């Protein structure tokens, strides 16, 4: 009802098509005494209308927010499933390849020590799943016992009761060391990465449940439907206006920025540790190759030991493609918590525009990101001394996981 008409027709139709009584709409433009939210002036909105539209806009913002969150959560979840499943498959496939090829290559050497290898793979598996062990001692034990058994089997003629320190003549060659280093780096790398994906996923899932405040509700009502109430339903909110409003509403969520970026940075970094620097494939799916090399070494050092007294890394593999895609997706969503207002405004709510008093230009500067930066926010009045607890706990989770990944990166 501008341009020389006070008829509330369009406000009536819009308010009605939104599932509210058409009877509640005043026939013509009335006095605005009653308005709790919209600036007091001549309006087509009654109390019931204002409240209803407030509820509507609030619910709409909620829907948008949880939709975006749902997208992000879906992405992280699919990433998690993909990487976990692929690491497990690499290990399992290594084991199957060993079981299938070793009897031909080594015969009784392998077949009478199969449980040793199976046990080693089970230990590696437990180690990946997070059970608290480490490979140095486990592999050391493995190689000790394996050397014992293999030496016994090589020499049925001599009965050998017990303490063979002839080792570190390196009967198995360099393979035990290579396996030690590579497995130590790669498996904790993989585990920490997967753990990081899990943590990010849980953080998003939990943050999504943080409710919008009353201040935010009123500011959003003012942002969206106060244009309708003040006689300009065709008017749409100014981008910077919308952005200040949402920055006011989503300050707590925006406080996750620093630690989210830290976590995602360390997660991008840790993927490098999946491989070595020598142009060799990942040990996570090629343990059997090093085992086989160790056994070959032992065989061709059988005489010498007796003393009584790794295929090149493919240009592209599954893991590498997965890592590229993952790094793309993670670099893409590192800005999430502060990009929320911009994207939510750009997509849905937001060239002469509604500044919240009237149609026109919106002067005020866009606020910075984060709770503290909203102390002066003109559109939303936010108390900065009252942070949300859920957000804080999630930030702690991000801190912890990040530390885990930095340590994992170092070792
Ligand atoms: C790897 O093998 C274990 C042991 O049977 C199994 O539980 C797990 O589902 C397998 N993972 C795969 C096939 O991705
Ligand atoms: Ca982005
Ligand atoms: Ca203030």
Compute the distance between CA of residue 399 and CA of residue 196 in angstroms, rounded to an integer: 11
CA 51, 52, 53, 54 torsion-angle sign = positive
d(CA 116, CA 150): 11
What totals of helices (H) and strands (E) does the chain contain, helices first? 16, 2
Contact 191, 128 (CB under 8 A): yes
Task: Answer yes or no: is the C-beta of 47 below 6 A from any ligand 1 atom.
Answer: no
Could you give the CA distance from residue 334 to residue 258 in angstroms, rounded to a whole number? 10
From the CA of 123, how far away is ligand 3's center (Å)? 58
CA–CA separation, 300 and 296 (whole Å): 6
For 272, the token pair is 């490098």
* Consecutive H or E run containing 359: strand 359-360
Residues 6+ apart with CB under 8 A from 143: 172, 176, 294
Pocket test for ligand 1, best of 87, 92, 97, 98 (most atoms within 8 A of CB): 92
Contacts of 405 (CB under 8 A, 6+ apart): 192, 193, 196, 263, 266, 267, 269, 270
**Residue found under tokens 């026109």:** 360
Q: Please state how this structure was obtained.
A: X-ray
Protein residue with its CA nearest to atom 3 in ligand 1 = 92
Task: Decide: 96 and 146 in contact? Cβ < 8 Å.
Answer: no
Q: Pull the structure tokens for residue 70.
A: 């749902």
Ligand nearest to the CA of 94: 1
Listed residue (122, 136, 365, 135) closest to 243, CA to CA: 365
Ligand 3 centroid from CA 255, angstroms: 18
H-helix or E-strand spanning residue 80: helix 47-106
Within 10 angstroms of residue 257's Cβ, the number of other Cβ atoms is: 18
User: Are 13 and 24 within 8 A, CB to CB?
Assistant: no
Measured CA to CA in angstroms, residue 46 lies from 2, 10, 128, 251, 269 at distances of 18, 15, 63, 31, 57
Resolution (A): 2.4
Q: How many CB atoms lie within 10 A of CB 134?
A: 12
Mode of pairing for the β-strands spanning 359-360 and 353-354: antiparallel
Q: Atom 4, ligand 1: which residue's CA is nearest?
A: 92
Assigned token pair, 98: 């060993």
Q: Whose CA is nearest to atom 2 of ligand 1?
A: 92
Which residue, judged by its Cα, is nearest atom 14 of ligand 1?
Answer: 89
Q: Whose CA is nearest to atom 1 of ligand 1?
A: 92
Query: How far is Cα 155 from Cα 305, in angstroms, rounded to an integer?
Result: 12
Nearest to 246 by CA among 272, 273, 269, 217: 217
Ligand nearest to the CA of 380: 3
* Position in ligand 1 atom list of the atom nearest CA 89: 14
Report CA(257)–ligand 2 centroid distance (Å): 12
Closest CA to 21 of 60, 54, 52: 52
């Amino acid at each position: 009802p501008a341009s020389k008409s006070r008829s509330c027709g369009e406000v009536r139709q819009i308010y009605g098509a939104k599932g509210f009584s058409l009877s509640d709409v005043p026939q013509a433009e009335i006095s605005g005494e009653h308005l709790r939210i919209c600036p007091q002036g001549y309006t087509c909105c009654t109390s019931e209308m204002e409240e209803n539209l407030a509820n509507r806009s609030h619910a709409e913002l909620e829907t948008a927010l949880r939709d975006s969150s749902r997208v992000l959560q879906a992405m992280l979840a699919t990433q998690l499933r993909s990487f976990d499943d692929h690491f497990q498959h690499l290990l399992n496939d290594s084991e199957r390849t060993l079981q299938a090829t070793f009897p031909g290559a080594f015969g009784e050497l392998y077949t009478q020590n199969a449980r040793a290898f199976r046990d080693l793979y089970s230990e590696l598996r437990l180690y990946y799943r997070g059970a608290n062990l480490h490979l140095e001692e486990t592999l050391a034990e493995f190689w000790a016992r394996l050397l014992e058994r293999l030496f016994k089997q090589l020499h049925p003629q001599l009965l050998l009761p017990d303490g063979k320190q002839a080792e570190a003549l390196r009967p198995f060659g360099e393979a035990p060391r290579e396996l030690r280093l590579r497995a130590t780096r790669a498996f904790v790398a993989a585990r920490s990465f997967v753990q990081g994906l899990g943590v990010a996923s849980d953080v998003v899932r939990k943050v999504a449940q943080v409710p919008l405040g009353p201040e935010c509700s009123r500011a959003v009502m003012k942002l969206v439907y106060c244009a309708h109430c003040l006689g300009v339903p065709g008017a749409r909110p100014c981008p910077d206006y919308c952005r200040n409003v949402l920055k006011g509403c989503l300050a707590n969520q925006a406080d996750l920025d620093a630690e989210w970026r830290n976590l995602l940075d360390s997660m991008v970094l840790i993927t490098d540790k999946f491989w070595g620097t020598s142009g060799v494939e990942s040990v996570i799916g090629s343990v059997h190759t090093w085992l086989a090399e160790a056994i070959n070494a032992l065989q061709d050092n059988r005489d010498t030991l007796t003393a009584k007294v790794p295929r090149e890394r493919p240009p592209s593999g599954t893991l590498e493609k997965l890592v590229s895609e993952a790094k793309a997706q993670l670099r893409d969503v590192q800005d999430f918590w502060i990009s929320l207002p911009g994207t939510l405004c750009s997509e849905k709510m937001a060239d002469r525009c509604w500044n919240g008093m009237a149609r026109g230009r919106y002067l005020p500067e866009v606020m910075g990101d984060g709770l503290a930066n909203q102390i002066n926010n003109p559109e939303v009045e936010v108390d900065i001394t009252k942070p949300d607890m859920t957000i804080r706990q999630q930030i702690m989770q991000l801190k912890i996981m990040t530390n885990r990944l930095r340590s994992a990166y170092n070792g």
